[PDB]
Design an enzyme around this catalytic site. Structure first.
Site, PDB file in Angstrom:
ATOM      1  N   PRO A 164     -11.645  -0.246  -1.704  1.00 38.83           N
ATOM      2  CA  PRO A 164     -12.860  -0.952  -2.124  1.00 38.83           C
ATOM      3  C   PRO A 164     -14.117  -0.162  -1.793  1.00 38.83           C
ATOM      4  O   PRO A 164     -14.156   0.599  -0.819  1.00 38.83           O
ATOM      5  CB  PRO A 164     -12.818  -2.258  -1.325  1.00 38.83           C
TER       6      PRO A 164
ATOM      7  N   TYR B  99       0.737  -1.262   0.000  1.00 40.37           N
ATOM      8  CA  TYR B  99       0.000   0.000   0.000  1.00 40.37           C
ATOM      9  C   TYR B  99       0.769   1.316   0.000  1.00 40.37           C
ATOM     10  O   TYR B  99       0.616   2.124  -0.917  1.00 40.37           O
ATOM     11  CB  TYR B  99      -0.974   0.020   1.184  1.00 40.37           C
TER      12      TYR B  99
ATOM     13  N   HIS C  70      -7.721   1.109   1.999  1.00 38.63           N
ATOM     14  CA  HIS C  70      -7.181  -0.212   2.294  1.00 38.63           C
ATOM     15  C   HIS C  70      -5.952  -0.380   3.170  1.00 38.63           C
ATOM     16  O   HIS C  70      -5.719  -1.469   3.693  1.00 38.63           O
ATOM     17  CB  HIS C  70      -6.944  -0.976   0.986  1.00 38.63           C
TER      18      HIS C  70
ATOM     19  N   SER D 221     -12.019 -11.998  -3.579  1.00 48.80           N
ATOM     20  CA  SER D 221     -12.137 -12.046  -2.134  1.00 48.80           C
ATOM     21  C   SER D 221     -13.581 -12.307  -1.737  1.00 48.80           C
ATOM     22  O   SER D 221     -14.516 -11.830  -2.383  1.00 48.80           O
ATOM     23  CB  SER D 221     -11.669 -10.734  -1.501  1.00 48.80           C
TER      24      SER D 221
END
Length: 596
Positions: A91, A78, A314, A525
């Site tokens: 997301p 990240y 995230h 996921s």
């Protein structure tokens, strides 16, 4: 105390991981490539060699740190990722549509939502949030202490995160954005008591009346640009003390609530797709993309037409912890509205100003242009699989998640004629500070099944056997990954250890097979939630898909994303083939009962 009792993240044995790696490569690389990699592996793990030395290094790292992977993962996955967080990292979530039909109703719901998050926050503040388990196995709760009152901060080389949850004087305000205008709203009284939903409503009403026009520059859209670009624009933005104070308020806020404006009606068949777009990126500069601050860890979005959802940064946490908050909040908004004590005078929520200069205006225009390009390139398909949910696989003694993953492998093969490197997130929360590892859905068994499924020479009885074997093989990989026995993070660790050891980059990581293995055409996921919601995100490679799902008892919520720049991918087609693969698997199993 709870964290201290958790086992520490382990370092798997070197040969074991490399063996699992070779097996995972078989279905996705050529015979020639596999044979070459096999030789590289043999040399890499040889006694007295490079691999053994790196392995010893990782084991040493685990002995001197709370979690050997934590920092490396946060940085590599990240903080050092320089693409925009919008679409590519953060997301989005679509929550159940609410029934309000006008402005006051939109604000009333937002008030309940805010009160609900604060109720959740009380458990975090008092560290009374119930420890989660998996049948008798404790889970790390650290992620819950990183989502509120936090924000990502742009950096010229890599980004950073600020977390004010446990500061001397924890923040007592949230930020509200309406028509691109940000407001600081205290949600607690001076006496320390939380504001009631009615009091919050009164404050949101003031905020609305103070931002009726959409004629102010959408400073928030700057947060949607490339990280190198935003790092520079950010540094320039905060040179001004007022701007710095406003940014500070946003970064410190418990969370952000976005009151979106009305948008053009669209055909009912593409409605959910458009709503998903609104939740993921805002829809564009002329819609709601400027009514956001994408660096913010938690952003709740309440739409003009009743739709609602959120988008989260995230770097802070994974899907499960976020949906835990969602389930608590949505349930709270349904609770009976009890007695309301005599209200009191409330202050005027502070409108956070931004002094614009020609330079800042230019940065904003550049950000609008950049985002427009990103949105044009995104292809989203939302699919509510109503046929069945966890119920069917369970009736067959098959793991619902494994069943779904194998169906995706079948759908992909049916479209492309070959398997692809596939990523499914696995939670490593059984370990202290554990985040994720990789479950590889493309396997020797999944490939044998998808090929057999479409082979008009293979008996249906054989297809059925191949199906169950592939599903159970996936369940086994899943169980191994959750117990810290997968190999992806381990291999990454060996590579990072080599870099830290100042030794030549090992050949195994420069191998074409490793490049193939790490290029995920399918990035997926499973994010189970009690709330009938769905999460979504952009693909991780230009020629890939981003697939997320929430399996309910009798249906499954799916999201599928793709990029238009790649002519080979189509989200709708992928979604349709997935639906058909799921149905075909049920059909096959029902036509071949195990006892009669």
């Amino acid at each position: 105390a709870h964290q201290d009792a958790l086992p520490r993240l382990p370092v798997p044995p070197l040969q074991q991981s490399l063996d699992y790696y070779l097996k995972a490569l078989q279905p996705i690389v050529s015979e020639e490539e596999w044979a070459h990699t096999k030789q590289l592996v043999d040399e890499f793990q040889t006694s007295g060699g490079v691999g053994e030395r790196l392995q010893k290094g990782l084991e040493r790292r685990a002995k001197k740190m709370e979690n050997w992977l934590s920092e490396w993962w946060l940085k590599t996955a990240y903080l050092q990722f320089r693409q925009p967080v919008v679409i590519y990292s953060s997301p989005g979530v679509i929550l159940p549509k609410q029934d309000f039909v006008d402005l006051q109703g939109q604000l009333r719901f937002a008030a309940k939502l805010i009160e609900g998050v604060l109720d959740f926050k009380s458990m975090i503040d008092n560290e009374t949030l119930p420890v989660e388990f998996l049948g008798g196995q404790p889970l790390c709760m650290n992620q819950y202490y990183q989502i509120l009152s936090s924000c990502r901060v742009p950096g010229p080389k890599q980004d950073s995160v600020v977390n004010f949850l446990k500061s001397k004087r924890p923040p007592t305000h949230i930020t509200v954005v309406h028509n691109y205008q940000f407001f600081e709203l205290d949600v607690y009284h001076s006496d320390g008591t939380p504001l009631t939903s009615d009091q919050i409503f009164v404050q949101l009403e003031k905020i609305w009346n103070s931002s009726l026009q959409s004629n102010k520059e959408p400073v928030g859209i700057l947060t949607s640009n490339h990280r190198n670009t935003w790092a520079k624009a950010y540094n320039n933005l905060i040179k001004d003390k007022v701007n710095r104070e406003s940014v500070n308020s946003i970064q410190k806020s418990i969370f952000t609530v976005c009151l979106d404006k009305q948008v053009p009606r669209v055909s009912d068949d593409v409605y959910r797709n458009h709503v998903a777009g609104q939740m993921l990126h805002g829809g564009g500069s002329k819609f709601n993309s400027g009514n956001r601050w994408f660096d913010k860890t938690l952003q709740f979005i309440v739409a003009e037409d009743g739709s609602c959802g959120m988008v989260y940064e995230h770097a802070a946490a994974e899907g499960p912890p976020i949906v835990a908050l969602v389930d608590h909040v949505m349930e709270y908004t349904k609770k009976p509205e009890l007695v309301r004590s005599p209200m009191v005078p409330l202050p005027m929520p502070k409108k956070l100003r931004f002094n614009i200069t020609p330079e800042i205006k230019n940065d904003i225009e550049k950000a609008k242009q950049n985002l427009s390009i990103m949105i044009q390139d995104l292809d989203i398909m939302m699919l509510t699989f109503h046929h069945f949910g966890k119920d069917f696989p369970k009736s067959e003694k098959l793991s619902p998640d494994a069943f779904i993953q194998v169906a995706l492998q079948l759908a992909y093969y049916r479209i492309y004629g070959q398997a692809c490197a596939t990523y499914e997130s696995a939670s490593l929360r059984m370990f202290h500070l554990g985040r994720t590892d990789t479950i590889r859905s493309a396997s020797i068994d999944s490939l044998a099944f998808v090929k057999g499924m479409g082979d008009s020479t293979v008996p249906e009885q054989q297809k059925v056997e191949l199906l169950r074997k592939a599903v159970q093989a996936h369940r086994a990989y899943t169980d191994r990954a959750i117990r810290g026995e997968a190999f992806d993070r381990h291999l990454l660790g060996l590579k990072l250890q080599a870099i830290e050891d100042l030794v030549s980059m090992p050949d195994i990581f420069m191998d074409t097979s490793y490049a193939i293995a790490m290029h995920f055409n399918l990035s997926t996921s499973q994010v189970p939630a009690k709330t009938d919601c769905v999460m979504f995100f952009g693909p991780v490679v230009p020629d890939g898909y981003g697939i997320c799902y929430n399996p309910m008892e009798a249906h499954i919520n799916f999201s599928v994303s793709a990029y238009n720049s790649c002519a080979e991918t189509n989200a709708a087609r992928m979604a349709h083939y997935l639906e058909k693969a799921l149905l075909d698997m049920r059909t096959l199993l029902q036509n071949h009962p195990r006892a009669k």
